[PDB]
Swiss-Prot record:
Function of the molecule: May act as a GTPase-activating protein for Rab family protein(s).
GO molecular function, one term: GTPase activator activity
Part of the full-length chain shown: 183 to 499 of 505
Keyword Disulfide bond: no
Chain ranges of the Rab-GAP TBC domain: 28-220
Gene Ontology, cellular component aspect: Golgi apparatus
The protein's name: TBC1 domain family member 22B
Gene name as annotated: TBC1D22B
Entry keywords, A to Z: Acetylation, GTPase activation, Phosphoprotein
Subunit structure: Interacts with ACBD3 and ARFGEF1. Interacts with YWHAB, YWHAE, YWHAG, YWHAH, YWHAQ and YWHAZ.
Length: 284
């Protein structure tokens, strides 16, 4: 059985074996079954029978209570703002620089109803109820993603500071040459790694790669795994990094690692490397 076929076998049953699905999703999810897989992996849609339109209605009940070129559409941008505004209202202890985090969920849920070229698709072409389902599903699946990293968005963002300190500790131990190169040109970890934590590396990768990365994050508690992905990401670019001979050139490269042409192969290689690091440095 092919990869796509194994997934369709798992998803055609009334009761989905969540453990087998997580195991199958860790090496990536076929594009064809990603919407339903993300609803299950996030925990939004329960796996066993022992709900969806009610969760969707609950989201619009919060809105009622208040009373890329695809992303250059005013309706798409207003939808991104609304989802985050509702999320912020629902989390009073808490982001704004996380508007990006909606994007992979929106593209994945839109791909369910769009054949090909979702990049140039006009959302005014979809029915209002279809667009409402994409919006409510993106809110609930992004809520599940943020639940694990809520410490990142509380007063003074303690989660991010702690995560960046965890990355420096890790990098100084795994790759002291790169660590000392940062110290030589006065590059602080927070100057490039803040955004890696805050946006879960999505500002460093093409959208397709973030989607493939989040298949694995959702198939896991991943908040600790991300730290090893960030470490693997720095090590992947260590030669280009060490070739930088100034603060400005070094910081620029760190914030714009050359991943434009990356796809599923590179993300798979990045994740396998992050697993190796986590395994090898688990007793440190």
């Amino acid at each position: 059985k092919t990869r796509l076929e194994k997934f369709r076998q798992l998803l055609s049953s009334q009761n989905t074996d969540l453990d087998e699905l997580r195991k199958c999703s860790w090496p990536g999810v076929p594009r064809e079954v990603r919407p339903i897989t993300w609803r299950l992996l996030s925990g939004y849609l329960p796996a066993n029978t022992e709900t969806l339109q009610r969760k969707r209605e609950e989201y619009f009940g919060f809105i009622e209570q208040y009373y890329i070129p695809l992303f250059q559409q005013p309706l798409v941008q207003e939808i991104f703002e609304r989802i985050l505004f509702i999320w912020a209202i629902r989390h009073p202890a808490s982001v704004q620089g996380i508007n990006d985090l909606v994007t992979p969920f929106f593209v994945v849920f839109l791909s369910e109803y769009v054949e090909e070229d979702v990049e140039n698709f006009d959302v005014t072409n979809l029915s209002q109820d279809m667009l409402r389902s994409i919006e409510a599903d993106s809110f609930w699946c992004m809520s599940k993603l943020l639940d694990g990293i809520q410490d990142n968005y509380t007063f003074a963002q303690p989660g991010i500071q702690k995560k960046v300190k965890a990355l420096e500790e890790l990098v100084s131990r795994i790759d002291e040459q790169v660590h000392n190169h940062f110290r030589r040109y006065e590059v602080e970890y927070l100057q490039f790694a803040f955004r890696w934590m805050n946006n879960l590396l999505m500002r460093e990768l093409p959208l397709r790669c973030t989607i493939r990365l989040w298949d694995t994050y959702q198939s896991e508690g991943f908040s600790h795994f991300h730290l090893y992905v960030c470490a693997a990401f720095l090590i992947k670019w260590r030669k280009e990094i060490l070739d930088e001979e100034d603060f400005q050139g070094l910081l620029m490269l760190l914030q714009n690692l050359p991943t434009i042409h990356w796809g599923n192969e590179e993300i798979g290689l990045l994740l396998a490397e992050a697993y190796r690091l986590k395994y090898m440095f688990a007793d440190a």
